[PDB]
Amino acid sequence: MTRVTVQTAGVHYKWQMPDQLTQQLRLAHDLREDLVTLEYEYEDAVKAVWSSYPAVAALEAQVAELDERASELASTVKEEKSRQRTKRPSHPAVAQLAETRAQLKAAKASRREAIASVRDEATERLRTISDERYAAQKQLYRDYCTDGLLYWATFNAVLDHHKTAVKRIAAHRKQGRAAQLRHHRWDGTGTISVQLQRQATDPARTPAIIADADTGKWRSSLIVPWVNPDVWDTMDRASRRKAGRVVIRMRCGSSRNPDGTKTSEWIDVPVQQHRMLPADADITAAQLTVRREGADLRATIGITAKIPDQGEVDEGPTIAVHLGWRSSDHGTVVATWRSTEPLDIPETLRGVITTQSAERTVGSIVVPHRIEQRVHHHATVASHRDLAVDSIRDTLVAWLTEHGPQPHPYDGDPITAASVQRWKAPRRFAWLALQWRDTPPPEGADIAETLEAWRRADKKLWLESEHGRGRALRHRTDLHRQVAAYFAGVAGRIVVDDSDIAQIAGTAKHSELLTDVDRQIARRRAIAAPGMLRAAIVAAATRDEVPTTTVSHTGLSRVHAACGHENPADDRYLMQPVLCDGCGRTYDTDLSATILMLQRASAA
RNA sequence: CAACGCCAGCGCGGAGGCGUCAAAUCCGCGACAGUUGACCCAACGUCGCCGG
DNA sequence: CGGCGACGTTGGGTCAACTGAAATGTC
DNA sequence: GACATTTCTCAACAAAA
């Protein structure tokens, strides 16, 4: 009942998404954008109420002056970086910018302290602004739900997700980091929701109750076919394939009657099921998420449920997994592991999980070299796509300047040689090619033929690139989850450090390395995705109730476990092995990190 | 011709098809907790500065 | 040609909050 | 009255540009 899971079923690809589903997705999108605009108009009001007090106004003026000076100096140092191919300008502007940034930071802290001091005096005004936002959200509910064909479950899902997002943005900006809500362009993707409410004195929302299409207490919302997993797992793969092809009925939301009223509307999505929830689970909700890859729009419906815990374990080795992104002969070495007891690696994972020695107590995890090649092919083909888009932009501009401006078929802004010359995305060229293939403009036959030829070629290349790279990335994640499943299956405890890979990626610009080498390293880290491997290991260990421990990452790479000495940062950590200063031994950083990891785990 | 992508969730492997205004599904194995937003990075195209 | 940077578009990698039900007003 | 929908809200403090 603590442990939440999500059972995902994959909607049939031949399913033509009904107009109701797309209208609901668009309503959810528009609602999110309206909430974003409400947040912008709330931040403006709160900034104004802060600026009302004169002390904060003076501090903000000082901050603005320092901002202007710092912007000038930063432009200067960027110019110097361009002039001196060094990434470290060596100009007086560098020290000037450092001092100006420190003074600006102190000014911002002074303003923040003044705000904190004056907060209690402005408590009523802040409360009123918050009340205005909340009442605007209630009116948004009435606009979209009471009168607006958006199912209240989708509205509540979007509003709860947005409120969580604004809470996390406020928390991020409490720590002093850039964080602000952004808009997104409608893409045909999104999610709709159904909340199954269980009041007091109601039966548990078990899969058998939900599957009961005739008398189930939640027929009006959701109907998910269900086989008992005891029966389900026994049968063949083909039998499960055929028996999982079932329709799920969701409550999509209202539709507008010609008389001006609403009529409830359900969708019957034909989904392929592969796995069933436990008969003890409480089905909390359901979501139909529409995602896009290439030109293709796919859909998956996930039934969220709460499962009881099956009891912790205490029989197995302790395993320490230390993350990395070192290139190697066989592939990126994502992580190195070491165990207190020897491990028998399954033959299917022989390449992926490698052991250094016959003791088999220490080894590494290797992303295959083929995944890297299959991801690099995407860049190879995006080169062709963008060259082709540039060529068709040239042709369109040439034809337009020969034959003058052409009226838009139905677009508000007429297409002209200038606007086409300023078009960037291939979306616009595809849209024009579609609009013109049917109804070419005056003397537009040749240009429409070329436009459609380009759009055919580009769509083919787009599908191939996006699908190839997506399949390669999901193969990588499949390998990550195979490794995580193995470890959570054998391990009695799993040791992971709390090393924020997000910070590692962000601060890589200060690497004192050539930016090309920084970009090679960051591309490798992205392709191997160590943070995904660690998250998978932690998740698999949590599901199987295998205990996990987190050790501080401070000193893991520098400190030599045998030496006990923290080597300096310029000890050639990029290459291996690294020479310890304390004893002059060429120790390996990965093995030492794992050893200190196990030590710090046991000490805790 | 191949390669690449698609063909009842996802990945790997095999058979048979389709070439995007398309098609067609079938079989074995493994894993599977997902939605959101924020941030960062990368790729690609065009360009600028400096240097060989 | 390579080092440094701008612009724009497109998409992925990391980290984390969350996964509810009482009250109310209909048919 | 059994069922579907409305409702509830705790809060500031962001960076390069």
Question: Residue A311 in 3-state DSSP?
Answer: coil
Q: Which two tokens stand for residue A429?
A: 């060229």
* Residues A451, A342 share a domain: no
Annotation-wise, does A252 bind a ligand?
A: no
Residue that terminates a domain, selected from A261, A282, A307: A307
For position A516, which CATH number holds?
3.30.420
- β-bridge partners, A301: A9, A288
Query: Does A184 reside within a domain?
Result: no
CA-only gyration radius of chain A, Å: 29
Let me know if residue A160 belongs to a domain.
yes
Dihedral of the CA atoms A386, A387, A392, A395 (nearest 10)?
A: 150
How far is it, in rounded angstroms, from Cα A564 to Cα A307?
A: 46
Q: Are the C-beta atoms of residues A538 and A494 closer than 8 Å to each other? A: yes
Q: Are residues A537 and A594 in the same domain?
A: yes
In a domain, A521, yes or no: yes
In a domain, A474, yes or no: no
CA–C1' A112–D13 (A)? 6
Q: Are residues A508 and A418 in the same domain?
A: no
Contacts of A368 (CB under 8 A, 6+ apart): A330, A331, A351, A352, A479
Residue A508 per-residue DSSP state:
G
Report the distance separating Cα A339 and Cα A317, nearest Å: 6
A212 touches strand D (CB under 7 A): no
Quick one: residue A263, left, alpha or beta (phi over 0 = left, psi -120 to 50 = alpha)?
beta
Q: Kindly state whether residue A408 falls inside one of the protein's structural domains.
A: yes
Q: What is the separation, in whole angstroms, between the first and last Cα of chain A?
A: 29
Q: What is the CA angle A202-A208-A212, rounded to 5?
A: 90
Distance CA A229, CA A307 (A): 14
Which amino acid is present at A345? I
**3-state secondary structure (DSSP) of residue A239:** helix
Resolution of this structure in Å: 2.9
Q: Does residue A108 share a domain with residue A135?
A: yes
Pairwise CA distance, residues A378 & A370, whole Å: 13
Length of chain A equals: 604
Cβ pair A537, A321 in contact under 8 A: yes
Looking at the fold, whether A84 and A166 belong to one and the same domain comes out as: yes
Residue type (1 letter), A29: H
H-only helix segments in A326-439: 369-403, 417-421, 426-438
Distance CA A311, CA A544 (A): 8
User: Which chain A residues in 130-159 sit with Cβ < 7 A of strand D?
Assistant: 130-131, 133-134, 138, 141-142, 145-146, 152, 155-156
Q: A14 and A145: one domain?
A: no
Residue A228 counted as domain residue: yes
Q: Which nucleotides of B are covered by protein (CB under 7 A)?
A: 4-12, 19-21, 23, 25-46, 48-51
Residues A502 and A361 in one domain: yes
| Domain contains A182 | no
Q: Find all residues with CB under 8 Å of A156, minimum gap 6, and list them.
A: A193, A195
**Do A582 and A544 form a contact (C-beta atoms < 8 A)?**
no
Residue–nucleotide distance: A40 CA to B36 C1' (Å): 19
Assess whether A400 and A514 both reside in one domain: no
Tell me: do A275 and A343 sit in the same domain: no
**Tokens 């969708």, residue located:** A267
Burial of A360 (0-12, 13-18, 19+ CB in 10 A): middle
Domain for residue A312, yes or no? no
Domain containing A508 equals 318-370+480-603
Q: Establish whether A145 is an annotated binding residue.
A: no
Residue where one domain finishes, among candidates A414, A447, A469? A469
Strands A493-497 and A318-326: parallel
How many structural domains comprise chain A?
A: 4
Q: Which nucleotides of C are covered by protein (CB under 7 A)?
A: 2-6, 8-23
Strand D bases near protein CB (under 7 Å) are 3-17
CB-strand contact A251/D, under 7 Å: yes
**Residues A196 and A167 placed together within one structural domain of the fold:** no
Q: Which of A257, A282, A307 is the last residue of a domain?
A: A307
Taking a C-beta distance cutoff of 8 angstroms, is the pair A337, A319 a contact?
yes
- What whole-number distance in Å separates Cα of residue A159 and Cα of residue A147? 17
Whether residue A554 is found in the same domain as residue A587:
yes
Give distance CA A88 / C1' C19 (Å).
Answer: 48
If asked whether residues A37 and A136 sit together in one domain, one would say yes
- Classify residue A120 by its DSSP letter: G
Q: Which nucleotide is closest to the Cα of A525 by its C1'? A: C13
**Is there a binding annotation on residue A161?**
no
Provide, in whole angstroms, the distance separating residue A225's CA from nucleotide B48's C1': 62
